Structures are given as structure tokens and as C-alpha cells.
Amino acid sequence: GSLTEDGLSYKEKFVVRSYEVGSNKTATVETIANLLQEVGCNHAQSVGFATTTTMRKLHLIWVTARMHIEIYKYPAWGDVVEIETWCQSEGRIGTRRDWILKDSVTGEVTGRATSKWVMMNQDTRRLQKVSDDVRDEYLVFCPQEPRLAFPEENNRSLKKIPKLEDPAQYSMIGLKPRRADLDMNQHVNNVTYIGWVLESIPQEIVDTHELQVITLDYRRECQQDDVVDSLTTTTSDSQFLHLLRLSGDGQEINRGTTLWRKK
Amino acid sequence: GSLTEDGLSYKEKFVVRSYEVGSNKTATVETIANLLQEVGCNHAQSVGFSATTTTMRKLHLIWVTARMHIEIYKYPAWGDVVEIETWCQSEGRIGTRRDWILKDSVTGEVTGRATSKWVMMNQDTRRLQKVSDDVRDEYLVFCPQEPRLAFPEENNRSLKKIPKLEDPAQYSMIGLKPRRADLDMNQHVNNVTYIGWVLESIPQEIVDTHELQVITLDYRRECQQDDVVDSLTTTTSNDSQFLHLLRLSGDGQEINRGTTLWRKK
Ligand SMILES: O=C(COC(F)F)N1C[C@H]2CCC[C@H]2C1
Numbered sequence: 257g258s259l260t261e262d263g264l265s266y267k268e269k270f271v272v273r274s275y276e277v278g279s280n281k282t283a284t285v286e287t288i289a290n291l292l293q294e295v296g297c298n299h300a301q302s303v304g305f306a307t308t309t310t311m312r313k314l315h316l317i318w319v320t321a322r323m324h325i326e327i328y329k330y331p332a333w334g335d336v337v338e339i340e341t342w343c344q345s346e347g348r349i350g351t352r353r354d355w356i357l358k359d360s361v362t363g364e365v366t367g368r369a370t371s372k373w374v375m376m377n378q379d380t381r382r383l384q385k386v387s388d389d390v391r392d393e394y395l396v397f398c399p400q401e402p403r404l405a406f407p408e409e410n411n412r413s414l415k416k417i418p419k420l421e422d423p424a425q426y427s428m429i430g431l432k433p434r435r436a437d438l439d440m441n442q443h444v445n446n447v448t449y450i451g452w453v454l455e456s457i458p459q460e461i462v463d464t465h466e467l468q469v470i471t472l473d474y475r476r477e478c479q480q481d482d483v484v485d486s487l488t489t490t491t492s493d494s495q496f497l498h499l500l501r502l503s504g505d506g507q508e509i510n511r512g513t514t515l516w517r518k519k
Numbered sequence: 520g521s522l523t524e525d526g527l528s529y530k531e532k533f534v535v536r537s538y539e540v541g542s543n544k545t546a547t548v549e550t551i552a553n554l555l556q557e558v559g560c561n562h563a564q565s566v567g568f569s570a571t572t573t574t575m576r577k578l579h580l581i582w583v584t585a586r587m588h589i590e591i592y593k594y595p596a597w598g599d600v601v602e603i604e605t606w607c608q609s610e611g612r613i614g615t616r617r618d619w620i621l622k623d624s625v626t627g628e629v630t631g632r633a634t635s636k637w638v639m640m641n642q643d644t645r646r647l648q649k650v651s652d653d654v655r656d657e658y659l660v661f662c663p664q665e666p667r668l669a670f671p672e673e674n675n676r677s678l679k680k681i682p683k684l685e686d687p688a689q690y691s692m693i694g695l696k697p698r699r700a701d702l703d704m705n706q707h708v709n710n711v712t713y714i715g716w717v718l719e720s721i722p723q724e725i726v727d728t729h730e731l732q733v734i735t736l737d738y739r740r741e742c743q744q745d746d747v748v749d750s751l752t753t754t755t756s757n758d759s760q761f762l763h764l765l766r767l768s769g770d771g772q773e774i775n776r777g778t779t780l781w782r783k784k
């Protein structure tokens with residue numbers, strides 16, 4: 257696509273593909289999640305990026321800490337969806353990347369997303385606050401006045417997610433990543449976690465309901481040779497509490513919540 | 520994309536995406552396989568197939584993949600535009616063939632090509648059957664009459680008989696299950712998932728040092744949503760050759776067999 261007239265956001269139109277849709281012939285939440293990360297990459301490339309000059313000298317990367325997605329209408333197979341994305345500072349806590357999905361024909365908002373990214377060393381995996389010299393390097397590509405995709409004060413994207421208590425109501429055990437699940441850098445794609453979380457949602461809910469909200473908290477990366485267990489409990493529209501953990505020791509890697517509506 | 524001037528083939532340009540590339544920052548063979556099935560679906564839709572005829576719908580009949588052969592000379596890089604041209608052709612009452620040609624949008628050179636053999640089957644009973652004349656006439660008007668082969672060679676590798684892998688296998692990837700992302704719109708496992716499962720038993724060292732040049736896959740059975748697969752591999756060979764076997768974890772029922780050919784980077 258291209259940067260908007262002010263250079264402070266990026267837009268891209270995607271045509272939804274045959275293998276990108278589910279049983280309802282509309283894009284899956286993982287296809288939407290894939291399209292959000294693609295428009296985010298093109299926005300970074302269009303302004304010279306995904307690290308700054310300081311970041312590569314210090315072996316620093318932006319890592320996902322939290323992802324929140326709300327979908328009102330899933331684009332059908334053959335439909336064009338327009339996604340607009342931008343970044344914003346959260347001082348020294350990290351960066352936020354926001355998205356707005358629109359119907360290319362009507363112009364209506366059909367979905368929206370927000371993500372929280374934190375600075376981390378590539379080698380030790382130790383968290384880090386954003387330095388001023390780093391902030392100066394990317395502020396010129398962000399709106400100065402706040403531009404929020406989810407502007408509601410105390411909303412679903414900032415809610416504290418509790419840890420799921422054993423025994424879980426549902427579970428999908430023995431989940432492993434394949435080469436298609438890794439990115440260009442050999443790490444498991446952040447979208448795979450969405451898929452693994454939804455694997456423990458019972459098929460009856462998937463057949464009768466539509467996923468409206470998904471909030472995911474990223475605690476630890478699943479390695480190529482790791483095995484995950486996906487756990488789910490109904491906390492309620494249908495509401496679920498989720499937990500991804502290592503098959504062996506039970507080390508937590510993700511926690512989240514989903515909200516579904518009757519079709 | 521669109522049908523060509525004669526309406527006997529379809530072309531589409533795809534821009535390669537960030538999540539669609541592997542370690543070498545070029546499209547994976549599963550991304551290529553996904554793009555081939557996407558250009559095939561748009562070709563069917565552009566001539567009124569949204570993918571059976573009136574006779575096929577009335578008789579609960581569908582086209583199923585029996586064999587897929589893909590040969591790649593250059594994998595498109597992240598950001599590159601790849602142009603795929605696809606067409607179909609009759610093989611009398613045996614079935615249909617769908618062929619593909621991948622081209623570099625900048626140079627116009629052929630960077631890859633594929634051929635597939637499809638057979639008619641009843642959706643419910645899963646029993647194969649020959650292409651009837653009533654069906655043949657309904658789709659012949661969308662195929663070239665003179666043969667148009669992507670792999671025309673006198674002794675091409677797309678028609679070679681694949682043997683069954685003998686136990687013990689040299690390599691293996693056990694306990695492979697499909698997730699919802701592996702199913703298509705009809706809830707059946709996507710034919711591309713089998714390519715990935717086959718490659719899961721190729722050792723990582725081969726993937727890091729070699730590039731996949733040829734892959735031939737034979738489809739014997741479909742893996743159900745609640746099935747578990749075992750991927751087996753044995754080296755049969757500057758170039759590396761492998762013999763593959765996908766089978767059910769339990770009884771050892773065969774679902775796929777294939778071969779791969781790799782070349783040093
Ligand atoms: O990768 C980041 C920061 O994390 C998150 F926001 F994507 N970026 C990408 C660069 C291009 C857009 C502004 C710059 C911030």
C-alpha cells in the first residue's frame with residue numbers, strides 16, 4: 257500500500273483468499289492477524305526499517321507483550337479489506353501499534369486491533385525501557401497527539417487477565433509447531449499462539465458462535481522443539497479464559513480471553 | 520487476475536508477504552503451493568465454478584487431487600511480484616490435469632512450474648470414478664484442445680512411479696495433528712498441509728544448506744480432523760534425494776507417498 261498524506265500512518269488493501277477462510281466462507285481470526293502483521297511490516301519498510309540505528313548496535317528488538325483484536329464483520333472470500341496502521345509512544349514503557357479494518361466498498365469499520373510492544377535484548381531476552389535516544393529516532397513517524405484505535409477509558413484491551421485454575425474445562429494437549437509456524441528469523445510466529453489458544457475452544461462454539469473479541473498476553477516464547485497444552489474454561493454471549501503452557505513442567509507461555517456472539 | 524485473451528488460461532500476480540517466507544527470506548514451498556491453489560480457484564470462479572458442473576452437483580461428485588508435482592528454479596523474495604499462469608486439460612476418462620507456470624514479473628523468466636492430476640470421486644462414499652461424457656463436454660470448452668503441457672519432456676519426473684518406504688525409516692516426525700488453520704472452508708485438511716507434514720521429517724541440516732528443487736506427492740487417503748500422522752523419510756541418493764511416507768500413527772494406514780530433490784545453495 258502506501259503511507260497517508262501526512263506520513264504518520266500506512267494503508268493497504270488485501271483481497272481475501274480461498275485458503276484464508278473458514279467454514280463460514282469469511283476470513284479466520286488468524287488470517288486477520290496475519291494481515292495485521294503484514295501491513296505493519298510494510299509500514300516499517302516504507303519509512304526505513306524492524307529496528308533503529310541504536311537498537312541494532314545494542315542487540316535490541318521490539319517484542320509483542322499483548323494483542324487485542326475486536327471484529328464486527330469478517331471479510332468474505334473475494335472481498336477487499338482496507339487496513340490502516342500507525343505507531344505511538346507509551347514513554348519508556350514501550351510502543352503501541354494500532355489497526356483499523358474497513359470494508360473497501362462501504363467504507364465502514366469492520367474491525368480494529370491494538371498491540372503493546374516492549375524493548376528486549378535479542379540474546380539474554382531481558383526486558384528494557386525505551387531510551388530517549390531510541391524515542392527520538394522513531395517519534396518523527398508517529399502522531400504527536402494521541403490517536404487511539406480503542407479510546408474507551410478502562411476498556412477490554414487494558415484489563416488484567418487472571419491465570420486459569422486447574423482443572424481446565426477444555427484442553428488440547430501435545431501441540432507442536434511445524435516449519436510453516438516459524439517466521440523468517442526461525443522464531444514461532446505470534447499468530448500461531450492465537451491458533452493454539454483457539455484449539456481448546458469446543459467445536460460446538462465455533463459452529464454456532466462468531467469470535468468477537470480476543471485478548472492475548474505474551475509471557476514466553478515457545479521454542480521450535482517445545483510442546484504446548486491449550487487450556488480453556490467458560491467464565492460466562494460466551495466468554496472464555498485461556499492458558500497456553502509447556503507440556504512438561506507446565507511453564508506459562510500465554511494467557512488470554514475470548515468473547516463470542518451467537519450467529 | 521484475469522483470463523487470457525483466448526479464455527483458455529488464467530493469470531494472477533501475487534506480492535510475496537513477510538510471513539510467507541522462510542530463513543532465506545524467499546517464499547516457502549507451502550506458500551507457492553497455497554498460491555497455486557488460489558490462482559486455480561480464481562480461474563474456476565472466472566468461468567462459473569463456485570468447483571463442479573451441473574452434472575457433478577446432481578451426482579454428488581467432486582474433483583480430488585491424486586498427484587502433485589512442483590519444480591522450482593528460483594523462490595520469489597519477500598516483496599517480489601510473482602506471476603502464475605494456470606490452465607486445465609482433459610486426460611479422457613482418467614481425470615483432469617491442472618498445470619501452472621510461475622514467472623518473475625520483472626524479467627519475465629520462468630522461475631517454477633507445477634502439474635497436478637485430479638480424479639472424479641463421490642463426496643459421500645469416497646469411491647473414485649471415470650469422467651463421464653456429459654461432464655467432459657461441460658468443461659472441455661474451457662481447456663485448450665491441442666495439448667499444452669507445463670512438463671512436456673520425453674522422460675519427465677512428474678509421471679514416475681513412487682515406491683513405498685521400507686521400515687525402518689532413516690528419519691521421522693511423530694504425532695503430527697492438524698489444527699483449524701490446516702482445514703479448508705469445507706472442513707477437510709488442506710492439500711498443502713501434507714506438503715508441510717512430509718517436509719517435517721527432512722532433517723534441519725538439509726533445510727539450512729540445500730534448496731528444495733523438486734517435490735512429487737501421491738495422495739492415497741485423506742487425513743481426518745481427529746487423525747494423527749507420522750512423517751517418515753529415507754535418503755535414496757551435489758544433490759540430495761529423499762523418499763517419503765505419511766501414515767496414520769495408529770494402524771499405519773498409508774495416506775501419502777512422495778519424493779523430494781534438493782540442491783546445494
Ligand atoms: O516496530 C516498531 C515499534 O513497535 C511497533 F510499533 F511496531 N516500529 C516500526 C517503525 C515504523 C513505524 C514506526 C516505527 C515503530
Ligand SMILES: O=C(COC(F)F)N1C[C@H]2CCC[C@H]2C1
Pocket residue numbers: 562563566568570582606607608615616617637658661662
Ligand atoms: O477444476 C476444474 C478441473 O479440475 C481440476 F483439474 F482442476 N475445472 C474448473 C474449470 C477451470 C477450467 C476448466 C474447468 C474444470
